[PDB]
Write a protein that binds this ligand. Sequence first.
Ligand SMILES: Cc1nc(N)ccc1-c1cnn([C@H](CC2CC2)c2ccc(-c3c(-n4cnnn4)ccc(Cl)c3F)c[n+]2[O-])c1
Length: 236
Amino acid sequence: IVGGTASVRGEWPWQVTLHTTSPTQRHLCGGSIIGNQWILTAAHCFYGVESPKILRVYSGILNQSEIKEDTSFFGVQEIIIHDQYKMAESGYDIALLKLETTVNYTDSQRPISLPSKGDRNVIYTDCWVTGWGYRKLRDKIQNTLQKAKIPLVTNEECQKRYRGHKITHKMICAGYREGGKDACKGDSGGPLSCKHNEVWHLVGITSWGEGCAQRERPGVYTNVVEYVDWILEKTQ
Ligand SMILES: Cc1nc(N)ccc1-c1cnn([C@H](CC2CC2)c2ccc(-c3c(-n4cnnn4)ccc(Cl)c3F)c[n+]2[O-])c1
């Protein structure tokens, strides 16, 4: 996260850190708890992943330094990538992880609601991007989960900034015209979380952008509302 600040314990209890353990253990991507057995993340995260055997899902984590060899994690029983996914910038950047067993929810590990039926024309004005990613294009993974408030941009404005890509209704853009706050490397797969009527909804999945926090180049997110039917079919 560029231009962000540190979170405190319990603040974003649906945020997970997905680790790979091949060839060594490291944070790979963010994700969001959406059910006792289900995480929603980005398909691009699995580009170099040979199988679900090497993944570990950690929940309830504020600082990466909390994870040690005896820290409990959930195994992944299945990775479900959207069948039309090709590359992040052309869309369909969405995946479900089915866990081996059910998370009992606690104060530190809680679900976020999907965008609700009836809310298709809500204007979200309180949206946040969170993650352990870089603070600038060449940087490092941060220890403490970071947060930044970012405004949504219309698809019309977003397309004018990205005339070499197809910005469709299945994407949502967010960013300031002057730049300065945005996702960056290591935040993909995590949530763009928007609060409406004091309930959090998973509006976007962090996906791609030109640079990080550059002027007139908003971040691009998978528009989760457009995938609700796909999610319900896969989870049932
Ligand atoms: C370096 C590293 N170290 C780790 N230990 C773990 C993971 C990584 C690493 C390197 N790239 N990525 C991902 C893709 C990859 C998982 C498949 C990525 C690509 C793009 C963006 C992005 C940008 N960016 C444009 N230019 N940079 N960022 C701007 C706006 C938005 Cl909205 C964005 F989503 C964010 N991420 O995370 C992760």
